Write a structure and sequence with these properties.
This is part of a larger assembly, with 2 copies of chain A, 2 copies of chain B, 1 copy of chain C (99 residues) and 2 copies of chain F. Chain A is α+β, with helices and mostly antiparallel strands. In chain A, 14% of the residues lie in helices and 20% in strands. Chain A has a two-stranded antiparallel ribbon. Helices cover 27% and strands 41% of the residues of chain C. The chains are: A alpha+beta (50), B mainly alpha (50), C alpha+beta (99), F alpha+beta (230). The interface between C and F is small, with 9 and 7 residues. The PDB classes it as ribosome.
Chain lengths: 50, 50, 99, 230, 51, 230, 228
């Protein structure tokens, strides 16, 4: 169902897109995984520890 | 951890790539063939090393 | 044609104003006449500086009112209105007059 | 709004009382700057006590972990709501769901060593959009207890220290509210004479922190007033 | 006040002056090692990965 | 030396914001070099105007709330940070927004001057709900590049400004997304030439041929240090 | 809206064919722009001339063996590829070398015309075991740019050359290695800047700063069209 939903959107089925590099402008070999992860900011902030 | 993955992907081989079985006059033009886009990072090749 | 009479005490300020006005004109419309300097009014005043008496004791002040005649030959739709929203720097009395 | 959730976000965000779940259904009047005003449909409405429900939104205030608990209305003006429906989204909620963190485009790859053991390498588009810029609130107390040698005093006429005391305050003392205060500032001039024998106990801002004075509370010793603000 | 001239003073007191970095559960002697500082715009100690 | 030179041959506007541009003809291998260099420069270093200081009347700090509106004041500052302005003559202007009455406050309600152009007439800012409510904010639009934030602009500002002016972060760059493609050129006698199809996505305020010209001048004046001196 | 121009602070000349152009300070994320642009131009676009084809007697393809030599013809092909020659006037010069006697054959042993010269005469070609061995090769030198290898050369050619002609990789561009870093420099307030360190090693026939200046003016004349 993840693959079938990735086929409803026009995305590649493997979940992996070829990505270029912003520094060199040239392709990363062996396509990498891009997606959306729900990332959280925990309350261990660095200018309360320094 | 990252650096051994970078080495294990770098010094390896595959049975066909760009520049299979060509001959190279040194390691400097090995890196020049990798950067220009004429060979692959793992492509078996006779080099002349000192 | 829109005649524009800039009047101010500070000359630099007046100059600045004039330039701004020209800029405003020139982007919207076309053929701005130009910033023509008219004669400056040097309104002189003498006063006795003593509280009581000493008549040869005097200060002579003046107010230099500068004039800047800017004219606009073709009033378009866009140009004339641009001035309504475009207010100039303080201490510069402008006086636009079409025809 | 987590794109990949489990559907239990709704029950947690309702059942923990951080959102303003509607008590009686109906429409809305939406004054809301201060309170959501809900007109009640007649079936859920009592015969006497004609009655329209006025919900209090708790705006920017201190949590127990110095985070910011804040409620924002998620219904417009003149819009039907049902019993049990949510009206104001609390902290970490989005239309009644449960939004702890945020969803971002993530690549899995080594990138030049900057994510070596467990580190994480972040673009500038994350920090330009303020999409993690959290808001912390600090309560700071100042008291002028009568330890010994008379009582302490709340006056701007701060000593030794010059035209670097009387600044983010009024003529009668205490921080004047709002402002871009940082570290080493003065908030509440609170110093005694005989403690050429004056000192500086004036509660200041701690080292390293900035901020905006959002609120000043004062239920002080019956007298705090100058000639008249009280 | 942190004026504009004390940062050159700071780069002239750092230069050849090692510091002892120490991770909090030090078990053997390789858990206290001395480095030379390189100044960081930031608030986090940048630590070389092999170490 | 049998090299050639490229020109901007066809500049198609797919919309007012998203617009491609060709480059023709490029030499062999130069396509990815010029494309990546123009990408890095066109994403880092373009000049665009943005909102810097917002001045609302009858306000204390940005974390308060106001009479008659939907979005809170932090929401208003975020929706103003997204604004897209295009001034022509000056480099620092002050706009005015005044509006009363029930209904949303678009960006098309700002009482424009002559040399400022607001290119998004459907950008929403507020949702005025009370008919007796009013809002009169005075925005200040500077012009720069990169990203300069509120913390660094807390002491950097020299012109001693009065207190009460909310500071909004400055997102100056009007380029948001850029991609280049190296196709095969259709040259009637050469087969070893290529074209560069740069696909920009702007803020609507920047003109793409002007942006490409400025990025080219930036690259040439940076390389003059290599050309002249050694 | 004014940009930081740098000063070229150092040319640490290690050898006559080595350099390290320390360069500071640039805007944040500009060292990679300049370095990558110069690196790609210096790798695959810089003009120059070297040996492309060679016709040798006694051999019929690249895997035969002539007598009198310790090394084989792959080694003579590789040591020929390592030779750096410069042509001034023309662009297609054929050269011929003949060597007999006990001793190695070096680059100074070749027969040269008025337009060509050798930048390293003590660069070895081969060695000779027999005093009766008479080696002979017809060394053709074209002029192109960058790098083209013998694999795609033999894929691109179609005309039937005579038997005994040998293809070699054409190291047209005179640089051998360019690889940079980007370090971090400091102007007294902003620490976000970055300093370029370009390393370069070439063959003969050029001075590394001359190669850098050539690549820079190649890119500037390439971008000379649509500027202000």
């Amino acid at each position: 169902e993840i693959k079938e939903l990735l086929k409803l959107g026009d995305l590649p089925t493997s979940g992996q897109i070829r990505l270029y590099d912003g520094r060199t402008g040239e392709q990363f070999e062996r396509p990498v995984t891009v997606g959306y992860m729900y990332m959280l900011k925990l309350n261990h902030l660095v200018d309360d520890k320094m | 951890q990252d650096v051994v993955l970078g080495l294990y992907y770098m010094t390896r081989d595959c049975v066909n790539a760009k520049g299979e079985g060509m001959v190279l006059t040194g390691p400097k033009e090995a890196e020049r063939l990798y950067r220009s886009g004429l060979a692959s990072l793992h492509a078996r090749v006779k080099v002349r090393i000192t | 044609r829109i005649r524009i009479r800039l009047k101010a005490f500070d000359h630099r300020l007046i100059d600045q104003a004039t330039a701004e006005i020209v800029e405003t004109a020139k982007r919207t419309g076309a053929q701005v006449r130009g910033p023509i300097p008219l004669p400056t009014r040097k309104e002189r005043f003498t006063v006795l500086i003593s509280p009581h008496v000493n008549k040869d004791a005097r200060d002579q002040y003046e107010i230099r009112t500068h004039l800047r005649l800017v004219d606009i030959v073709e009033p378009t739709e866009k140009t004339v209105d641009a001035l309504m929203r475009l207010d100039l720097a303080a201490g510069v009395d402008v006086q636009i007059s079409l025809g | 709004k987590p794109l990949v959730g489990t559907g239990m976000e709704r029950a947690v965000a309702v059942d923990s009382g951080v959102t303003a779940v509607a008590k009686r259904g109906g429409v809305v009047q939406y004054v809301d700057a201060s309170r959501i005003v809900i007109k009640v449909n007649e079936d859920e409405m009592y015969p006497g006590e004609a009655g329209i429900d006025i919900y209090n939104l708790t705006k920017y205030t201190r949590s127990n972990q110095n985070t910011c608990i804040n409620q924002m209305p998620c219904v417009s003006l003149g819009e039907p709501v049902e019993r049990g429906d949510v009206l104001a989204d609390g902290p970490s909620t989005d239309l009644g769901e449960l939004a702890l963190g945020q969803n971002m485009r993530v690549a899995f790859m080594p990138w030049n060593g900057y994510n070596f053991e467990d580190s994480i390498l972040v673009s500038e588009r994350v920090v330009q959009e303020d999409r993690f810029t959290t808001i912390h609130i600090q309560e700071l107390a100042c008291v002028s207890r009568d330890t010994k040698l008379g009582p302490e005093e709340i006056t701007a006429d701060i000593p030794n220290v010059g035209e670097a005391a009387l600044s983010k305050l009024d003529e009668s003392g205490i921080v004047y509210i709002g402002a871009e205060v940082t570290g080493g500032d003065i908030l509440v001039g609170k110093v005694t004479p005989k403690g050429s024998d004056v000192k500086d106990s004036s509660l200041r801002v701690p080292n390293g922190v900035s901020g905006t004075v959002i609120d000043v509370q004062v239920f002080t010793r019956d007298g705090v007033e100058k000639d008249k603000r009280a | 006040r942190e004026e504009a001239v004390v940062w050159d003073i700071l780069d002239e007191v750092i230069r050849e002056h090692p510091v002892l970095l120490n991770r909090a559960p030090t078990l053997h002697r390789l858990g206290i090692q001395a480095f030379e500082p390189v100044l960081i715009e930031g608030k986090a100690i940048q630590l070389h990965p092999l170490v | 030396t049998e090299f050639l030179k490229p020109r901007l041959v066809d500049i198609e506007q797919v919309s007012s914001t998203h617009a491609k541009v060709t480059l023709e003809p490029l030499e062999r291998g130069f396509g990815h070099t010029l494309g990546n260099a123009l990408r890095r420069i066109l994403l880092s270093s373009m000049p665009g105007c943005a909102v810097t200081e917002v001045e609302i009347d009858g306000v204390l700090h940005e974390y308060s709330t106001k009479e008659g509106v939907q979005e809170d004041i932090l929401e208003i500052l975020l929706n103003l940070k997204g604004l897209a302005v295009r001034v022509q003559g000056k480099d620092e202007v002050i706009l005015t927004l005044n509006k009363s009455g029930i209904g949303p406050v678009t960006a098309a309600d700002i009482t424009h001057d002559g040399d400022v152009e607001i290119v998004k007439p459907q950008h929403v800012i507020c949702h005025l709900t009370d008919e007796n409510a009013s809002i009169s904010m005075r925005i200040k639009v500077q012009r720069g590049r990169g990203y300069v934030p509120a913390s660094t602009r807390i002491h950097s500002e020299e012109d001693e400004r009065p207190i009460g002016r909310l500071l909004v972060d400055a997102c100056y760059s009007p380029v948001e997304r850029i991609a280049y493609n190296v196709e095969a050129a259709r040259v009637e006698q050469r087969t070893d030439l290529d074209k560069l199809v740069i696909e920009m996505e702007t803020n609507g305020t920047i003109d793409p041929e002007e942006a490409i010209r400025r990025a080219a001048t930036i690259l040439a004046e940076q390389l003059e240090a290599f050309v002249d001196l050694r």
